[model samples]
Target: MVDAFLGTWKLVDSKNFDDYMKSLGVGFATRQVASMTKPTTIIEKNGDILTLKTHSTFKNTEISFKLGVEFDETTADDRKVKSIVTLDGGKLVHLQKWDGQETTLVRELIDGKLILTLTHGTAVCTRTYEKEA
Candidate 1:
C-alpha cells in the first residue's frame, strides 16, 4: 500500500533543477529562486488517494488526486496541465501533460528520505528531502 510514502519531508539537496525548470519555460529570474529555495513536501495517502503539499518561503502549492485518475492542475510555475499519478513499486510515477508536451515526475521514499526525480525532454533533475516525521 504506499505506506512508505506518507510523511512530511524537508528539502535537503537538489541537482540540475534549473535545467529542468528551464525546459518547462521558466525564466532565468524565477529559476534563480527555484534553485535557491528549499521546499518542504507533505504527503498524505488515504487508500488510492494521494495529497501532496509543497511549501516554501516563496511559493506554496498543493494537489490532491486519486491514483490512475487524471485531473486538471495549475502548477507552481503557473502552468496548467492534466496530471496523473501511478504507483510503481515504492515509487510514485506522476505524468503531467501541458502545452503539447509531457513531463515525468517520479517520487520515491528511500533511506528515510523523499526523493523526487523530474524529467522534461533531455533535462532531468533529482531533489532529495529528509523525512521530518
Candidate 2:
C-alpha cells in the first residue's frame, strides 16, 4: 500500500542538489534560493487520489494524481512539464518530461526515513527526510 508515504516528512539532509538543479537548466539566482530552502513534504491519500504537497518559507506547491496517470505539473522552479508517478516495489517512481528533457525521482522508506533520489543526466541528488512525530 501507499500508506507508508502518508505522513508529514521534513527535509533533514540534501546532497548535490545544486548540481542537480543545474542539470535542469535552473538559473544561478533561483538555484541559490532553492538550495537554501528546507521544505516539508506532505503525502495524503483520499480514495484513489494521492496528493503530494511541498511547503517551505520560500514557496509551496502541490499536485494530486492517481497512480500511472499522466498530468501537467508546474515544478517548484516553474518548469511546465508532464509528470507521472507509479509504485514500483516499495518505492514511488516519478518521471517528468519537458522540452526534450526528462528526470526521475525515486522515493522510498528506509530506516524510518524517507529517502528521495533525483536524477537528471549525469547529475544526481539525494535528500533524506524524517517523519514528523
Name the top TM-score candidate: 2
lDDT of 2: 0.94
Q: What is the per-residue lDDT of model 1 for residues 1-133, given as tens digits with 9 covering 90 to 100?
A: 7778888889899999999999888989999987889998889987777899999988999999998899999999998999999888768999999878999999887787788999999999999999885
- What is the lDDT of every predicted structure here? 0.90, 0.94
Give the per-residue lDDT of model 2 (tens digit) for 1-133.
7998899999999999999999988899988998899999999999879999999988899999998999999998889999999999899999999998989999999999999999999999999999998
Clashing pairs in 2: none
Q: What is the C-alpha RMSD of each candidate to the true structure, in Å?
A: 1.2, 0.9
Identify the candidate with maximal lDDT.
Answer: 2
Q: Which residue pairs collide, candidate 1?
A: none
C-alpha TM-scores of all predictions: 0.95, 0.96
The TM-score measured for candidate 1 stands at 0.95
Error of 1 at 16 (Å): 0.3
Candidate 1's C-alpha runs over 4 A off are: none
